[PDB]
Design a protein around this ligand. Structure first.
Ligand SMILES: CCCCCCCCCCCCCCCC(=O)O[C@H](COC(=O)CCC)COP(=O)(O)O[C@@H]1[C@H](O)[C@@H](OP(=O)(O)O)[C@@H](O)[C@H](O)[C@@H]1O
Ligand SMILES: CCCCCCCCCCCCCCCC(=O)O[C@H](COC(=O)CCC)COP(=O)(O)O[C@@H]1[C@H](O)[C@@H](OP(=O)(O)O)[C@@H](O)[C@H](O)[C@@H]1O
Ligand SMILES: [Ca+2]
Ligand SMILES: [Ca+2]
Ligand SMILES: [Ca+2]
Ligand SMILES: [Ca+2]
Lengths: 523, 523
């Protein structure tokens, strides 16, 4: 395939596949090879021809994932009949997985470029939709049976390593690149963008902890080189995030984006106070309030690391678990806010009842404290003779006995649901990250000085990848075939390219000699 | 069907279906189309005739749900053989679901008016039973396989929107009404009764929080217009609830009814104290005690909102979860009351043992406090040399270590059981609400002033519904067929009626043109 069909043709392919799934899966419950042949025939084109059949069979995965999207819409609309459409959606996902795994054997470049990565357009209504591809489509709706395909994961691995890159000419194509052969655009790969963001997060943390522990004298400090590099890095981060915020408006509202914005916003306020102190009110007062508000950013700077270590399996599985647990705890937090607003209005009315509001601050404080179990009735002892005790102990009962134990229940159920699906949801997280990666002088000097051995290791590993790809292309293999040097295959791996062939010849000679050492040891 | 059979005939139809389910489902384990034909034949009537077959096939759903009722009674009586009758009850529910979904395709008005909504009478014993219909019957016994039918949910949607209304001539009929066409009786619909109760609950809350935060001076306040509107609304609510309490006696004992009665009772006491202060003992003392007891009603006024937002899915799912969790925690609360009564009798006997009861109040206080974890042994330090310590620490062990952790266990199990069945139990809750909705000058001025834009939005949405129903009746559709404008159907929705037909003609012209742009893109 080289030219894309029109959106109404892709709409017809989607309707033929939806009709096919409605006929083959009409019940809660299959995917025979005749059904797979029907799915291949549901697109259209002359069976006498080829590259006209492939032109419409290129949109097969995109159309099956839009069928999954439509069945999710159907389950949203017919809430009572959600199980039938969830069954149909799952059947579509399994058929899609079968198609991806079949075309992985048939032709790999056609699977990657045309089926999975090409951003097709579809006319769902009279409106024309944005160009999405099957990878982004399967990740947005969390098609875990599709994301856990061998071809899907291979495509994500090739994109991750930078082996497939977005075409600058057309942003819907994703041509391969030649890594067989110190290019700078190689550092634009998702592996190296991820690794450099990880190194820069650890470097940001190291510059942070060398600043907040910098205050030794009560006077204004020297404003060292590391403090300047630190505020330069943070003002770079806040201008990057505010350019993305102005450009991408109200879709930059991810939790991690707001978390980083809170981190950089706090450090910018600290920077401003420090700058005002350096060029002055009281200079030591501004320096003190600067280091205090900067020290408020230390949980954010140490919790930033989990975002930039999501590629590591331990941290990513942990954050998948935490995302599901907070998503379950939304119930507790709504009930806690409602009960807290109710009893807060009660106590503030008891405060206003005598005539003047005098202990409003201790009320807000102590009631907020009650969720931690640290609440004391000493504050309300001189308040109202039966009313404060009744309200406070009813509130403490509803929070500590009822709602916190409900929170433990929600967390237990959320963890039991997510620990079974931890690998699948982590694969969806890494897929989301991989597809996210395909959409002054002092700082540069510091970056060059600090990133040098990492660039060295990246370059030597890239040369090892290039020699591996050269070996895999010397044979008729798919550029990632010899990476592990496994025991069950006597002809695999890469020694460093004739030393590897000599090692394989040694392997087959020793194996064939020692098998034929006794003629009865056969079959 | 136009005339209802007698209760002994409906009893015979119920017995024939019970016999049929006993023959087809004799084991723990089916519902073949011959069984569905047998169920149609189990009612009776001449197969040569029609409207005499339909006269007795009208009670098929009511009779299958009484069969479900009888199998629930059987499982209550034969506790050992409860699994067989639960199987039979489930089989009856599935057969009933099949019948509802079949008659939804066959004839919709006959499904709604005659099968589901007509309140038939049955002679279970020599006594004659009340007129119940299949909707109310399936909700009282929680027939979730029947409530989650497409026809059941459609019938509930039509009742909810006011499209089917109870006949004033006969209260067992439920004739349709004509919405095709600013009627006041349109506001009597369950959608608008629900929405106006929601708006009035938020308005009650807004008037409440503008009163308890009204006290600024220690003297008696001005008795503003909002305070008078607030006490008028609350005395209207308490007279409404007491008329319902006198009329419906000891079946008005729902939790939410008692909760609202507690809210309105507290506000009435506050109203009485405020009224006595205004027309006087000490006036500022009565004003103070009025605002204190009114501020005691703030958790009730803020927790009232969950009742009037049950139609919203988030709040309704949350309250379904909370109902199941409290139903599980009944064990903990019984054991807690028993252990508390035991150790309370122990400490009060230790108080009486020296000769006089002097610290009884601190005993009741501290032991009640122990469940919150705030208990201190300082109160009992000067009490008895080994006895108070042994009793108090045994009590604190049984409450904090044993029983509160048991409460966490009960909550975990209750949430794990209800989160799987959250949609089904919420559908049963909304079904219960929908069937609940089919069983002075200053206040009117305030209501007219405050409900005006909501009445405006209701009227413009009603006109949109009327034009939609006019379009769906111009075709041979079922008055709710074009509501979503879906992508998989090229002929659906309502544009605002020739603009919609022009849009559909544009859709078919563009689709047929772009499909036939290449003749090979076919089939
Ligand atoms: C008062 C003093 C207290 C100070 C604070 C103390 C520190 C608190 C530590 C909090 C850490 C919690 C980690 C949980 C993260 C997670 O469990 O997930 C989040 C849910 O947690 C929540 O709500 C938590 C609500 C409270 C939701 O994550 P997300 O929706 O924002 O999606 C990302 C996006 O898509 C991309 O981020 P970026 O690349 O950077 O742009 C992806 O790279 C990334 O992989 C994610 O997918
Ligand atoms: C000391 C200071 C403390 C002050 C108080 C603090 C606030 C406490 C907040 C409590 C809110 C708890 C919400 C749970 C509601 C629920 O989870 O459910 C309840 C079980 O909770 C319970 O036992 C809780 C026992 C403690 C049972 O609900 P229900 O039996 O009463 O049935 C309704 C009927 O049928 C109709 O009410 P109305 O239309 O208004 O007439 C239907 O509309 C409605 O949908 C329901 O079905
Ligand atoms: Ca006060
Ligand atoms: Ca080997
Ligand atoms: Ca005593
Ligand atoms: Ca359409």
């Amino acid at each position: 395939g080289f030219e894309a069909p029109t959106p109404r043709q892709i709409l017809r392919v989607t309707l033929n596949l939806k009709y096919l799934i409605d006929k083959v899966v009409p019940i809660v419950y299959i995917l025979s090879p005749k059904v797979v042949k029907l799915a291949y025939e549901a697109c259209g084109g002359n069976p006498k021809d080829k590259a006209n059949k492939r032109k419409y069979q290129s949109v097969i995965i995109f159309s099956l994932l839009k069928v999954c999207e439509w069945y999710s819409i159907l389950a949203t609309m017919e809430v009572h009949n959600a199980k039938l459409y969830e069954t149909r959606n799952l059947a579509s996902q399994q058929l899609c997985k079968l198609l991806i795994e079949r075309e992985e054997t048939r032709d790999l470049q056609f699977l990657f470029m045309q089926l999975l990565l090409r951003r097709y357009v579809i006319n769902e209504n009279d409106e024309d939709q944005e160009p999405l591809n099957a990878l982004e489509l399967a990740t947005d709706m969390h098609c875990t049976t599709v994301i856990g395909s061998s071809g899907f994961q291979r495509c994500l691995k090739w994109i991750w390593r930078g082996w497939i890159v977005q075409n600058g000419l057309d942003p819907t194509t994703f041509i391969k690149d030649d890594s067989l052969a110190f290019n700078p655009v190689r550092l634009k790969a998702p592996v190296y963008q991820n690794y450099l963001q990880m190194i820069f997060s650890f470097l940001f943390l190291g510059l942070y902890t060398l600043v907040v522990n910098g205050k030794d004298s009560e006077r204004v400090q020297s404003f060292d080189l590391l403090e300047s590099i630190f505020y330069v890095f943070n003002t770079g981060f806040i201008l990057d995030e505010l350019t993305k915020l102005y450009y991408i408006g109200y879709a930059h509202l991810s939790f991690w984006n707001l978390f980083n914005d809170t981190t950089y916003l706090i450090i910018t306020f600290a920077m401003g106070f420090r700058a005002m102190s350096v060029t002055p009110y009281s200079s030591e007062d501004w320096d003190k309030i600067s280091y205090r508000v900067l020290s408020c950013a230390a949980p954010f700077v140490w919790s930033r690391l989990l975002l930039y270590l999501e590629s590591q399996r331990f941290i990513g599985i942990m954050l998948v678990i935490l995302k599901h647990m907070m998503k379950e705890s939304i119930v507790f937090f709504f009930l806690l806010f409602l009960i807290m607003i109710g009893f807060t209005q009660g106590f503030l009315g008891l405060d206003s009842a005598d005539g003047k509001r005098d202990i409003t601050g201790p009320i807000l404080g102590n009631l907020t404290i009650t969720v931690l179990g640290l609440g004391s009735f000493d504050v309300f002892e001189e308040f109202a003779p039966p009313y404060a005790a009744i309200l406070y102990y009813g509130y403490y009962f509803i929070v500590s006995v009822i709602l916190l134990n409900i929170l433990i229940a929600l967390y237990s159920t959320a963890y039991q649901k997510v620990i079974d699906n931890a690998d699948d949801e982590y694969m969806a997280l890494m897929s989301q990250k991989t597809l996210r990666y395909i959409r002054k002088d002092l700082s540069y000097t510091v970056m060059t000085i600090v990133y040098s051995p990492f660039l060295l290791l990246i370059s030597v590993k890239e040369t090892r990848e290039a020699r591996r790809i050269k070996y895999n292309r010397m044979k008729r293999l798919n550029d990632d075939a010899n990476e592990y040097d496994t025991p069950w295959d006597l002809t695999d791996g890469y020694l460093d390219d004739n030393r590897n062939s000599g090692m394989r010849a040694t392997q087959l000679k020793n194996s064939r000699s020692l098998k034929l050492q006794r003629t009865a040891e056969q079959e």
